Amino acid sequence: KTDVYKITASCMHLGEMKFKQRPREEQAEADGTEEGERVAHLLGVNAAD
Amino acid sequence: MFVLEQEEYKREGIDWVFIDFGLDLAACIELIEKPMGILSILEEESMFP
Structure with a gap:
């Protein structure tokens, strides 16, 4: 689910x-982190990668 | 060790005054006046009997 x-x-x-x-x-290089973090977490890909 | 790190630093836009250390050796690797120079004369001439 x-x-x-x-x-x-x-x-989104x-x-x-x-x-x-x-x-x-x-x-x-892009101005922040939160933007791509809310991508990263929902996937569990290496955040540094 | 002095320059490359800075080539990104200068682009970041962080308060960082650049540090020159006065260690350069570029002006010996290739010829200023005509690229290669010696090699081209050396090659083209050899066939000439």
């Missing part, structure tokens, strides 16, 4: 990951 909803709802969660322009190269 919880598991199908856990995998289903991260697909993922589009929050707001990359920002840091023009020294253009390699952006």
Whole structure:
């Protein structure tokens, strides 16, 4: 019950990951964590990975 | 050990004044005036009897 909803709802969660322009190269890293954490936990994938 | 860590630091946008340490050796690996130089003369000439 919880598991199908856990995998289903991260697909709302993922589009929050707001990359920002840091023009020294253009390699952006995204401004936060919570955005992708609420993805990570519902999956149990290595949070550092 | 001095530079690469900083090449990301300067991009992060963190309060970090850059640290130069004055240890460079780039100007010997390839030729300033024409790329390779010696190798190209060395190669092209050899066939000339």
